[PDB]
Short mmCIF file of C-alpha atoms in Angstrom, two decimals:
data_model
loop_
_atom_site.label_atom_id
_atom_site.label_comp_id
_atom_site.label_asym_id
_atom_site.label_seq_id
_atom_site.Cartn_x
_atom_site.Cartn_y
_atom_site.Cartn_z
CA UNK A 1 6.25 4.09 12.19
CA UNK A 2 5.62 0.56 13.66
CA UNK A 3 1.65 0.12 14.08
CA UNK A 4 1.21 -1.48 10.12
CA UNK A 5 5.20 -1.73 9.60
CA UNK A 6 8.12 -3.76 11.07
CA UNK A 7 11.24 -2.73 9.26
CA UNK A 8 14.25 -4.46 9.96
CA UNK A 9 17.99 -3.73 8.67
CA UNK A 10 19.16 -6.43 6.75
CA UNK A 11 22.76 -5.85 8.62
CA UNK A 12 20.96 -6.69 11.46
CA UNK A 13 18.33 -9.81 10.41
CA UNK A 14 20.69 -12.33 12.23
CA UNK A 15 20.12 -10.68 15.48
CA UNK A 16 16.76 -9.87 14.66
CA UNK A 17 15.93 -13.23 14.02
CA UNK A 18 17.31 -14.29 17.31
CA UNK A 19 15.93 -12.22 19.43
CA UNK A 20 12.73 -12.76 18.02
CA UNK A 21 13.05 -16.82 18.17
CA UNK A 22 14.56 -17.02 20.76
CA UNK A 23 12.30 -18.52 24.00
CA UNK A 24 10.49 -20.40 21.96
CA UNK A 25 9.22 -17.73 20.09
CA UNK A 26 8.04 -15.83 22.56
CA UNK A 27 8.41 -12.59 20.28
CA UNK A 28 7.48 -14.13 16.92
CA UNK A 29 4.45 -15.73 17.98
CA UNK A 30 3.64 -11.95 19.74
CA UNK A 31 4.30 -10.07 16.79
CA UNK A 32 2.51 -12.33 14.89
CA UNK A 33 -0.63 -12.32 16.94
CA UNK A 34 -0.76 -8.49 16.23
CA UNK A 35 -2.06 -9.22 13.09
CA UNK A 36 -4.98 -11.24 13.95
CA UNK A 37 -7.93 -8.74 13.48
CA UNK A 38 -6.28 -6.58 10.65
CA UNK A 39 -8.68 -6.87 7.18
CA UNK A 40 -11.22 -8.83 9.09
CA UNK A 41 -13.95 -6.35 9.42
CA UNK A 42 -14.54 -5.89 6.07
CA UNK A 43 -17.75 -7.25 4.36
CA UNK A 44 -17.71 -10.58 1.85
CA UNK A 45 -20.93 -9.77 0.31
CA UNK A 46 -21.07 -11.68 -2.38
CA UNK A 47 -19.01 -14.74 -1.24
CA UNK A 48 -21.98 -14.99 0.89
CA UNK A 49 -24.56 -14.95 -2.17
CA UNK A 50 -26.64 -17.98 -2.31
CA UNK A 51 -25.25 -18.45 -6.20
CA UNK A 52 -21.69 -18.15 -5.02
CA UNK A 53 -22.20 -20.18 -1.63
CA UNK A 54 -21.32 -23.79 -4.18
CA UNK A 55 -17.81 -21.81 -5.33
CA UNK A 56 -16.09 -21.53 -2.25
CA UNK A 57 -14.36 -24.78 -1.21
CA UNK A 58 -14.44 -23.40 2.69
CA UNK A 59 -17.00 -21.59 4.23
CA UNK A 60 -14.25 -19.24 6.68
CA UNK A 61 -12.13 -18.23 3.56
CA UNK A 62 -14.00 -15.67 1.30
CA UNK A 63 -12.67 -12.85 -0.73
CA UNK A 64 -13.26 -9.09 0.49
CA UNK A 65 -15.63 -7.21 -1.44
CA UNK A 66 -13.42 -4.33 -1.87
CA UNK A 67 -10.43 -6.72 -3.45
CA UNK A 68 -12.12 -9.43 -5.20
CA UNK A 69 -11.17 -10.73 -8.71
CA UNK A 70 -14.44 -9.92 -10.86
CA UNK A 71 -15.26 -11.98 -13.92
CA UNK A 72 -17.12 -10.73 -16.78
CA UNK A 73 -20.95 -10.95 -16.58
CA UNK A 74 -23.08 -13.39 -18.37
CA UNK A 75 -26.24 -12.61 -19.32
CA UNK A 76 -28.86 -13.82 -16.65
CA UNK A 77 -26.83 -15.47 -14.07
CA UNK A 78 -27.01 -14.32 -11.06
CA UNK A 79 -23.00 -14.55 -9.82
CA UNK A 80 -21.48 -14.81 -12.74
CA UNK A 81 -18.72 -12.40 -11.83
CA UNK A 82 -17.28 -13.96 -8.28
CA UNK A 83 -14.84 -16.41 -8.02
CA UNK A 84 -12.96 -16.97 -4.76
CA UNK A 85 -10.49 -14.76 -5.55
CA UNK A 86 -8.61 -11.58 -4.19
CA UNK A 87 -6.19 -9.01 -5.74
CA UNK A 88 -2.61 -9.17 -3.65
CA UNK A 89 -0.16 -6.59 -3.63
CA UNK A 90 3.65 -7.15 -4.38
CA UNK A 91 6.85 -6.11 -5.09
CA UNK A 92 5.79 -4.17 -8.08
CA UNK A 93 2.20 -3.70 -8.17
CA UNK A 94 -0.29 -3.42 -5.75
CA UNK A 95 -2.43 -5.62 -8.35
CA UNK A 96 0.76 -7.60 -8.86
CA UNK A 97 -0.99 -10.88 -7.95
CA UNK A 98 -4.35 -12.77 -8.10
CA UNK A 99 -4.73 -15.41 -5.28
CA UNK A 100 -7.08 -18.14 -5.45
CA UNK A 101 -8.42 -21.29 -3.79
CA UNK A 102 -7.42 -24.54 -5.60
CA UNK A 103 -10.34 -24.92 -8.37
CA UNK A 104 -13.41 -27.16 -7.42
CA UNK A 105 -13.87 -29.33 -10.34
CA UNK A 106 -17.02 -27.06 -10.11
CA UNK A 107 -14.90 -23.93 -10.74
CA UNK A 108 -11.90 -24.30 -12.47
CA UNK A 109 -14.07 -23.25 -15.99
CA UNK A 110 -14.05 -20.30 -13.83
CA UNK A 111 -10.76 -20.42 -12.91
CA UNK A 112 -9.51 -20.31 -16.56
CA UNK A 113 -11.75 -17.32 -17.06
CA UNK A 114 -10.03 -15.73 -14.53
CA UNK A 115 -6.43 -16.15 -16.33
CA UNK A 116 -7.46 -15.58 -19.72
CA UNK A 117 -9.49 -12.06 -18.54
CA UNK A 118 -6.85 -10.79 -16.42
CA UNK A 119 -4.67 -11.87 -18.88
CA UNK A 120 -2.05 -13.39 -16.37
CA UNK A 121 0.52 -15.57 -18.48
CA UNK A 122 1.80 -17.67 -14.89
CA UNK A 123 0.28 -20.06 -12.05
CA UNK A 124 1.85 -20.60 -9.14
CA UNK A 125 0.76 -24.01 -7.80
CA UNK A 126 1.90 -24.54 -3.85
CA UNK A 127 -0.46 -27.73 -3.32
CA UNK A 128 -0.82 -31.04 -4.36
CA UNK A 129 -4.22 -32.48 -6.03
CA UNK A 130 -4.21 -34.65 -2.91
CA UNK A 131 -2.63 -34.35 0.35
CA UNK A 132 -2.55 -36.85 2.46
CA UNK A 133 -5.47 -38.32 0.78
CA UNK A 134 -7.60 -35.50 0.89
CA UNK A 135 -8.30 -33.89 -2.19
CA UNK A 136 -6.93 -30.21 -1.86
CA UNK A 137 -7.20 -29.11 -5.76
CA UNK A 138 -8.39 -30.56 -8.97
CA UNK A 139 -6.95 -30.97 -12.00
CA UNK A 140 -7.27 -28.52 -13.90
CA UNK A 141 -4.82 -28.81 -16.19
CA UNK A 142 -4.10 -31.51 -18.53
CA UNK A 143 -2.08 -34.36 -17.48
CA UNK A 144 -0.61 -35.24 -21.60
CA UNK A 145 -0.74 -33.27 -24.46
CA UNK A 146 -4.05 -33.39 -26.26
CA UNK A 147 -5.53 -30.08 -25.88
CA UNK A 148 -8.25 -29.76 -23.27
CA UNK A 149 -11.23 -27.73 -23.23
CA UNK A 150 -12.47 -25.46 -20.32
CA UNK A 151 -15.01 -23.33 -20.92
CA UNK A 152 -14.24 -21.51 -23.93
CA UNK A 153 -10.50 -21.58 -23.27
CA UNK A 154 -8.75 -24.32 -24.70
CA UNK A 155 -5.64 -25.76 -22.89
CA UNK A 156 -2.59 -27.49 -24.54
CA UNK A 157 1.07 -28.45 -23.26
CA UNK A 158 3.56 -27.42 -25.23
CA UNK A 159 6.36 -29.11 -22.62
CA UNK A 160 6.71 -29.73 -19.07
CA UNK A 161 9.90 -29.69 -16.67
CA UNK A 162 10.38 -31.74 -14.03
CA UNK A 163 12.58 -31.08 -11.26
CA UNK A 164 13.47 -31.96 -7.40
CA UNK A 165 10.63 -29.89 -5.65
CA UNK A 166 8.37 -28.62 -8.48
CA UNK A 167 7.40 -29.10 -12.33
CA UNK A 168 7.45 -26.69 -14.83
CA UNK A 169 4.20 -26.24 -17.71
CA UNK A 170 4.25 -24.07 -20.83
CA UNK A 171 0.59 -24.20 -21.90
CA UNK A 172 -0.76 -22.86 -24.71
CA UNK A 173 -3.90 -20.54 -24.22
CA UNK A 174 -6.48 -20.37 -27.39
CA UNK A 175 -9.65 -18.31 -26.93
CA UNK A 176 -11.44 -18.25 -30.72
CA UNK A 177 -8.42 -17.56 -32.71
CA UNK A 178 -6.66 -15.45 -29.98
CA UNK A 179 -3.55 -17.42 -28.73
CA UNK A 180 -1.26 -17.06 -25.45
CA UNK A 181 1.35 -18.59 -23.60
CA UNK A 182 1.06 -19.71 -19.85
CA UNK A 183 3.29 -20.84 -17.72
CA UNK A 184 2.47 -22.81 -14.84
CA UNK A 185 5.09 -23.43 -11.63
CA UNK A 186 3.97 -26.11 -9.19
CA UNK A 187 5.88 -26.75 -5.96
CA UNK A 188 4.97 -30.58 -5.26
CA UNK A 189 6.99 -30.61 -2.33
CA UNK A 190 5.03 -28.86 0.54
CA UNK A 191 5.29 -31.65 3.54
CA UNK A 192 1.76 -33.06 4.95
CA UNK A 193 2.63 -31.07 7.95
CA UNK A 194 4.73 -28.17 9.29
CA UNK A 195 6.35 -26.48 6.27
CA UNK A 196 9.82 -27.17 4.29
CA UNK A 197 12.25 -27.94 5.72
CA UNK A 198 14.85 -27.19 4.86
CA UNK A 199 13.44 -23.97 4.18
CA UNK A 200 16.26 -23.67 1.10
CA UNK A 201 13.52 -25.61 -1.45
CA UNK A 202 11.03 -23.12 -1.50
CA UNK A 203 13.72 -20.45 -1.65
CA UNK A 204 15.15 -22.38 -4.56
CA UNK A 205 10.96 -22.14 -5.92
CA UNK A 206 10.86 -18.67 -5.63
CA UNK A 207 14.59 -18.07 -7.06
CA UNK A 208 13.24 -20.37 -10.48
CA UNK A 209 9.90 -18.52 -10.54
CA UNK A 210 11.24 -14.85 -10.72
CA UNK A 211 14.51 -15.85 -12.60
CA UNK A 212 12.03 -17.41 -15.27
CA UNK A 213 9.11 -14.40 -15.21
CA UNK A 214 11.00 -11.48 -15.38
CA UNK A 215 9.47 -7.93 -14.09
CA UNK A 216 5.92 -8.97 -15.41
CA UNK A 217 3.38 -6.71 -15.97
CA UNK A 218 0.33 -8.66 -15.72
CA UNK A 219 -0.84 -10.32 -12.78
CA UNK A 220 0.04 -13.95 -11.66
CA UNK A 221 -2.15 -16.30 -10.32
CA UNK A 222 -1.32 -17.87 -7.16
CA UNK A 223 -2.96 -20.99 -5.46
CA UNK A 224 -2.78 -23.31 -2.79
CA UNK A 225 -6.14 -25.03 -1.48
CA UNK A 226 -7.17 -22.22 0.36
CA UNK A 227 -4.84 -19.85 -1.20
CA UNK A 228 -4.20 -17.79 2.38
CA UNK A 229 -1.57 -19.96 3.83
CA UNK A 230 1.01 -21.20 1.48
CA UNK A 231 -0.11 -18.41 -0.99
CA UNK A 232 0.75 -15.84 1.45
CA UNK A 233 3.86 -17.44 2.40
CA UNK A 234 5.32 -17.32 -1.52
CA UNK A 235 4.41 -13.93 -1.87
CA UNK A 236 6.01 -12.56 1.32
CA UNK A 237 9.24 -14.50 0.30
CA UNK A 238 9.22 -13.57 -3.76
CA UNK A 239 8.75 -9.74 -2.32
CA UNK A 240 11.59 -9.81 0.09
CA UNK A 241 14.01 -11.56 -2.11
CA UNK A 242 13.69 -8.54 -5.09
CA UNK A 243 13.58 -6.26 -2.10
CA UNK A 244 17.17 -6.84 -0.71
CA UNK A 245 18.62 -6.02 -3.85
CA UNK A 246 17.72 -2.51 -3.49
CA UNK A 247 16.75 -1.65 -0.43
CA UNK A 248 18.71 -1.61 3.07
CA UNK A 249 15.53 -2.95 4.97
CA UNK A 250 13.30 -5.51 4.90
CA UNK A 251 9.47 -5.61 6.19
CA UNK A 252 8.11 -8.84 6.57
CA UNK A 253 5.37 -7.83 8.71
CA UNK A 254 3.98 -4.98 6.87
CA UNK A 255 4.16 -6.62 3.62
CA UNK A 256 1.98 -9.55 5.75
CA UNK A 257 -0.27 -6.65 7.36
CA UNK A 258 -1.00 -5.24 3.80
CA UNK A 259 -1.51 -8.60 2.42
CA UNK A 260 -4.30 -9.19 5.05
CA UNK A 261 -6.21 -6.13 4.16
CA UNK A 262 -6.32 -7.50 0.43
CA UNK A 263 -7.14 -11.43 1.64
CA UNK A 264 -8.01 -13.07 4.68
CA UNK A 265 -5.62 -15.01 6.33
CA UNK A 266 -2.79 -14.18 3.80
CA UNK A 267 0.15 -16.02 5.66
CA UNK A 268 -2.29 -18.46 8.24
CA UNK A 269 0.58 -19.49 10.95
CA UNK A 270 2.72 -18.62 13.07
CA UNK A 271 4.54 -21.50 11.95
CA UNK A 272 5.02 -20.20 8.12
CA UNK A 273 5.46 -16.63 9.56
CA UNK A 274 8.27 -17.91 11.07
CA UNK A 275 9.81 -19.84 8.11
CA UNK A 276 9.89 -16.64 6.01
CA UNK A 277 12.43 -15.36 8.42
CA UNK A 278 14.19 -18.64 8.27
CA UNK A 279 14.15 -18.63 4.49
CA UNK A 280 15.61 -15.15 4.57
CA UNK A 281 18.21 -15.68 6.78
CA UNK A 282 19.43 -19.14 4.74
CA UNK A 283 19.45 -16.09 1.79
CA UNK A 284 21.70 -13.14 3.74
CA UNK A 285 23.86 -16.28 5.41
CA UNK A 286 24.89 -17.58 1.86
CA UNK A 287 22.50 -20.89 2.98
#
Protein backbone atom coordinates (compact mmCIF):
# COMPACT_ATOMS: atom_id res chain seq x y z
CA UNK A 1 0.00 0.00 0.00
CA UNK A 2 2.05 3.07 -1.18
CA UNK A 3 0.60 6.30 0.71
CA UNK A 4 3.28 5.81 4.02
CA UNK A 5 5.36 2.92 2.12
CA UNK A 6 7.65 2.65 -0.95
CA UNK A 7 8.81 -0.92 -1.18
CA UNK A 8 11.21 -1.76 -3.65
CA UNK A 9 12.67 -5.36 -4.69
CA UNK A 10 16.13 -5.48 -4.07
CA UNK A 11 16.41 -7.54 -7.61
CA UNK A 12 15.23 -4.58 -8.95
CA UNK A 13 17.11 -1.41 -6.90
CA UNK A 14 19.43 -0.87 -9.99
CA UNK A 15 16.55 -0.01 -12.14
CA UNK A 16 14.82 1.55 -9.45
CA UNK A 17 17.48 3.75 -8.79
CA UNK A 18 17.62 4.80 -12.36
CA UNK A 19 14.51 5.51 -13.08
CA UNK A 20 14.19 7.46 -10.15
CA UNK A 21 17.59 9.60 -10.86
CA UNK A 22 17.35 9.76 -13.85
CA UNK A 23 16.36 13.60 -15.33
CA UNK A 24 17.96 15.05 -12.82
CA UNK A 25 15.98 13.63 -10.31
CA UNK A 26 12.96 14.45 -11.44
CA UNK A 27 11.36 11.39 -9.48
CA UNK A 28 13.57 11.46 -6.37
CA UNK A 29 13.20 14.96 -5.65
CA UNK A 30 9.07 14.15 -6.23
CA UNK A 31 8.97 11.36 -4.03
CA UNK A 32 10.83 13.07 -1.68
CA UNK A 33 8.70 16.16 -1.53
CA UNK A 34 5.80 13.79 -0.51
CA UNK A 35 7.10 13.76 2.72
CA UNK A 36 7.20 17.33 3.50
CA UNK A 37 4.11 17.80 5.83
CA UNK A 38 4.15 14.20 7.40
CA UNK A 39 4.76 14.56 11.56
CA UNK A 40 4.56 18.27 11.28
CA UNK A 41 1.26 18.94 12.83
CA UNK A 42 1.97 17.66 15.93
CA UNK A 43 2.42 19.95 19.03
CA UNK A 44 6.16 20.72 20.71
CA UNK A 45 4.77 21.87 23.90
CA UNK A 46 7.33 21.89 25.97
CA UNK A 47 10.25 22.65 23.56
CA UNK A 48 8.38 25.81 23.51
CA UNK A 49 8.49 26.28 27.48
CA UNK A 50 10.16 29.40 28.49
CA UNK A 51 12.66 27.02 30.79
CA UNK A 52 13.42 24.85 27.82
CA UNK A 53 13.53 27.81 25.16
CA UNK A 54 17.86 28.13 26.36
CA UNK A 55 18.16 24.05 25.47
CA UNK A 56 17.42 24.01 22.01
CA UNK A 57 20.39 25.07 19.85
CA UNK A 58 17.68 26.02 16.86
CA UNK A 59 14.53 27.46 17.27
CA UNK A 60 12.77 25.25 13.94
CA UNK A 61 14.07 21.84 15.35
CA UNK A 62 12.08 20.75 18.51
CA UNK A 63 11.13 17.35 19.68
CA UNK A 64 7.33 16.16 19.41
CA UNK A 65 5.56 15.94 22.52
CA UNK A 66 4.29 12.57 21.89
CA UNK A 67 8.11 11.13 21.21
CA UNK A 68 10.32 13.10 23.33
CA UNK A 69 13.17 11.66 25.50
CA UNK A 70 12.01 12.58 29.21
CA UNK A 71 14.56 13.00 31.95
CA UNK A 72 13.90 12.38 35.48
CA UNK A 73 12.40 15.29 37.50
CA UNK A 74 14.23 17.40 39.93
CA UNK A 75 12.66 18.77 42.60
CA UNK A 76 11.50 22.45 41.82
CA UNK A 77 12.67 23.07 38.39
CA UNK A 78 10.46 23.84 36.17
CA UNK A 79 11.83 21.67 32.84
CA UNK A 80 13.83 19.50 34.30
CA UNK A 81 12.64 16.58 32.21
CA UNK A 82 13.11 17.97 28.35
CA UNK A 83 16.03 17.76 26.49
CA UNK A 84 15.98 18.15 22.70
CA UNK A 85 15.51 14.81 22.14
CA UNK A 86 13.14 12.28 20.28
CA UNK A 87 12.65 8.45 20.40
CA UNK A 88 13.45 6.92 16.62
CA UNK A 89 12.35 3.75 15.46
CA UNK A 90 14.68 1.06 13.82
CA UNK A 91 15.44 -2.08 12.66
CA UNK A 92 14.59 -3.72 15.89
CA UNK A 93 12.76 -1.49 18.07
CA UNK A 94 10.54 1.14 17.57
CA UNK A 95 12.47 2.77 20.69
CA UNK A 96 15.62 1.43 19.07
CA UNK A 97 17.22 4.90 19.01
CA UNK A 98 17.43 8.27 20.88
CA UNK A 99 18.33 11.24 18.55
CA UNK A 100 19.65 14.37 19.76
CA UNK A 101 21.02 17.80 18.88
CA UNK A 102 24.81 18.16 19.44
CA UNK A 103 25.01 19.23 23.33
CA UNK A 104 25.19 23.07 24.10
CA UNK A 105 27.93 23.37 26.52
CA UNK A 106 24.68 24.41 28.37
CA UNK A 107 23.24 20.87 27.98
CA UNK A 108 25.48 18.22 27.61
CA UNK A 109 25.10 17.64 31.82
CA UNK A 110 21.85 16.89 30.36
CA UNK A 111 22.94 15.04 27.71
CA UNK A 112 24.81 12.53 29.96
CA UNK A 113 21.63 12.20 31.95
CA UNK A 114 20.05 11.18 29.07
CA UNK A 115 22.59 8.11 28.42
CA UNK A 116 23.04 7.05 31.82
CA UNK A 117 18.85 7.00 32.38
CA UNK A 118 18.07 5.33 29.27
CA UNK A 119 20.83 3.35 29.90
CA UNK A 120 22.17 3.44 26.20
CA UNK A 121 25.86 1.96 26.21
CA UNK A 122 26.69 3.79 22.36
CA UNK A 123 26.90 7.43 20.69
CA UNK A 124 26.84 7.88 17.37
CA UNK A 125 28.65 11.14 16.57
CA UNK A 126 27.99 12.35 12.65
CA UNK A 127 29.42 16.04 13.26
CA UNK A 128 32.39 17.71 13.98
CA UNK A 129 32.81 20.20 17.16
CA UNK A 130 33.37 22.76 14.39
CA UNK A 131 32.48 22.87 10.87
CA UNK A 132 33.73 25.14 8.86
CA UNK A 133 34.38 27.31 11.76
CA UNK A 134 31.15 27.26 13.18
CA UNK A 135 30.76 25.52 16.24
CA UNK A 136 28.19 22.62 15.55
CA UNK A 137 28.71 20.52 18.98
CA UNK A 138 30.67 20.79 22.13
CA UNK A 139 32.81 18.71 23.72
CA UNK A 140 31.42 16.73 25.69
CA UNK A 141 33.58 14.19 26.11
CA UNK A 142 37.02 14.19 27.32
CA UNK A 143 39.77 14.83 25.02
CA UNK A 144 42.74 12.52 27.43
CA UNK A 145 42.20 10.28 30.03
CA UNK A 146 41.64 11.90 33.38
CA UNK A 147 38.16 11.23 34.25
CA UNK A 148 35.74 14.09 33.73
CA UNK A 149 32.82 15.06 35.62
CA UNK A 150 29.29 15.91 34.20
CA UNK A 151 26.73 16.23 36.36
CA UNK A 152 26.75 13.36 38.55
CA UNK A 153 28.10 11.06 35.85
CA UNK A 154 31.64 10.75 35.73
CA UNK A 155 33.39 10.16 32.33
CA UNK A 156 36.73 8.27 31.73
CA UNK A 157 38.52 6.79 28.49
CA UNK A 158 39.50 3.60 28.76
CA UNK A 159 41.01 3.71 24.86
CA UNK A 160 40.26 5.34 21.72
CA UNK A 161 40.61 4.10 17.93
CA UNK A 162 41.44 6.06 15.31
CA UNK A 163 40.71 5.33 11.86
CA UNK A 164 40.28 6.86 8.13
CA UNK A 165 36.71 8.44 8.55
CA UNK A 166 35.85 8.10 12.28
CA UNK A 167 37.36 7.40 15.91
CA UNK A 168 36.40 4.93 18.15
CA UNK A 169 35.83 5.72 22.41
CA UNK A 170 35.30 3.13 25.13
CA UNK A 171 34.31 5.31 28.09
CA UNK A 172 33.77 4.30 31.28
CA UNK A 173 30.36 5.41 32.93
CA UNK A 174 30.40 5.77 37.00
CA UNK A 175 27.22 7.03 38.66
CA UNK A 176 27.93 6.63 42.77
CA UNK A 177 29.41 3.26 42.72
CA UNK A 178 27.33 2.01 39.70
CA UNK A 179 29.74 1.47 36.70
CA UNK A 180 29.10 1.06 32.75
CA UNK A 181 30.70 0.88 29.59
CA UNK A 182 30.02 3.32 26.60
CA UNK A 183 31.03 3.31 23.48
CA UNK A 184 31.16 6.24 21.42
CA UNK A 185 31.49 6.12 17.25
CA UNK A 186 32.25 9.48 15.64
CA UNK A 187 32.29 9.88 11.85
CA UNK A 188 34.77 12.98 11.42
CA UNK A 189 34.48 12.84 7.88
CA UNK A 190 31.09 14.46 6.85
CA UNK A 191 32.30 17.15 3.99
CA UNK A 192 31.43 21.04 4.74
CA UNK A 193 28.97 20.59 2.01
CA UNK A 194 26.94 18.05 0.00
CA UNK A 195 27.43 14.66 1.69
CA UNK A 196 30.21 11.75 1.22
CA UNK A 197 31.29 11.09 -1.41
CA UNK A 198 32.09 8.46 -2.14
CA UNK A 199 29.14 7.34 -0.45
CA UNK A 200 31.29 3.86 0.46
CA UNK A 201 32.74 5.80 3.91
CA UNK A 202 29.69 6.12 5.63
CA UNK A 203 28.68 2.65 4.48
CA UNK A 204 32.00 1.48 5.82
CA UNK A 205 30.61 3.72 9.36
CA UNK A 206 27.60 1.95 9.52
CA UNK A 207 29.23 -1.63 8.60
CA UNK A 208 31.91 -0.85 11.92
CA UNK A 209 29.03 0.43 14.08
CA UNK A 210 26.65 -2.67 13.83
CA UNK A 211 29.58 -5.21 13.36
CA UNK A 212 30.88 -3.73 16.80
CA UNK A 213 27.17 -3.34 18.74
CA UNK A 214 25.63 -6.40 18.08
CA UNK A 215 21.58 -6.77 18.27
CA UNK A 216 21.48 -4.25 21.28
CA UNK A 217 18.80 -3.97 23.42
CA UNK A 218 19.03 -0.62 24.78
CA UNK A 219 18.74 2.40 22.90
CA UNK A 220 21.64 4.31 21.12
CA UNK A 221 22.12 7.76 21.06
CA UNK A 222 22.50 9.42 17.86
CA UNK A 223 23.70 13.07 17.11
CA UNK A 224 24.62 15.40 14.61
CA UNK A 225 24.11 19.30 15.31
CA UNK A 226 20.66 19.23 14.69
CA UNK A 227 20.30 15.58 14.86
CA UNK A 228 17.47 15.50 11.79
CA UNK A 229 19.76 15.51 8.88
CA UNK A 230 22.78 13.38 9.17
CA UNK A 231 21.00 11.52 12.11
CA UNK A 232 18.29 10.52 9.88
CA UNK A 233 20.52 9.64 7.17
CA UNK A 234 22.57 6.86 9.52
CA UNK A 235 19.56 5.43 10.66
CA UNK A 236 17.84 4.91 7.29
CA UNK A 237 21.18 3.29 6.07
CA UNK A 238 22.01 1.03 9.47
CA UNK A 239 18.11 -0.19 8.95
CA UNK A 240 18.39 -1.11 5.35
CA UNK A 241 21.70 -2.76 5.57
CA UNK A 242 20.27 -5.53 8.47
CA UNK A 243 17.17 -5.45 6.34
CA UNK A 244 18.59 -7.06 3.09
CA UNK A 245 19.77 -9.89 4.89
CA UNK A 246 16.37 -11.09 5.46
CA UNK A 247 14.05 -9.58 3.62
CA UNK A 248 13.45 -9.48 -0.35
CA UNK A 249 12.48 -5.65 -0.19
CA UNK A 250 13.67 -2.67 0.89
CA UNK A 251 11.66 0.63 2.04
CA UNK A 252 13.59 3.59 2.19
CA UNK A 253 10.77 5.86 2.13
CA UNK A 254 8.59 4.44 4.72
CA UNK A 255 11.30 3.84 7.08
CA UNK A 256 11.95 7.95 6.32
CA UNK A 257 8.00 8.59 6.59
CA UNK A 258 7.95 6.77 10.05
CA UNK A 259 11.04 8.44 11.12
CA UNK A 260 9.32 11.87 10.54
CA UNK A 261 6.37 11.10 12.67
CA UNK A 262 8.93 10.35 15.61
CA UNK A 263 11.32 13.67 14.71
CA UNK A 264 11.11 16.51 12.58
CA UNK A 265 13.04 16.64 9.67
CA UNK A 266 14.53 13.08 10.18
CA UNK A 267 16.53 12.85 6.80
CA UNK A 268 16.49 17.06 5.86
CA UNK A 269 17.45 16.78 1.91
CA UNK A 270 16.79 15.70 -0.96
CA UNK A 271 20.35 15.56 -1.38
CA UNK A 272 20.99 12.84 1.58
CA UNK A 273 17.69 11.14 0.52
CA UNK A 274 19.30 10.53 -2.46
CA UNK A 275 22.70 9.26 -1.14
CA UNK A 276 20.94 6.49 0.85
CA UNK A 277 19.99 5.02 -2.45
CA UNK A 278 23.47 5.56 -3.67
CA UNK A 279 24.94 3.96 -0.58
CA UNK A 280 22.66 1.00 -1.13
CA UNK A 281 23.30 0.41 -4.47
CA UNK A 282 27.45 0.64 -3.87
CA UNK A 283 26.13 -2.37 -1.18
CA UNK A 284 23.88 -4.78 -3.76
CA UNK A 285 26.68 -3.80 -6.68
CA UNK A 286 29.58 -5.32 -4.52
CA UNK A 287 30.86 -1.29 -4.39
Amino acid sequence: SHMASRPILIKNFAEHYRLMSADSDFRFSEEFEELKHVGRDQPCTFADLPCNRPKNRFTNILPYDHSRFKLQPVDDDEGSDYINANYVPGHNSPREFIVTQGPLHSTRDDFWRMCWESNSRAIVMLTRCFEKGREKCDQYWPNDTVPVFYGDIKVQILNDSHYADWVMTEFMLCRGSEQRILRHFHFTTWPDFGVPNPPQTLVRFVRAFRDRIGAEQRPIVVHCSAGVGRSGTFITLDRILQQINTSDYVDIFGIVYAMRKERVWMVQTEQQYICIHQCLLAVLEGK
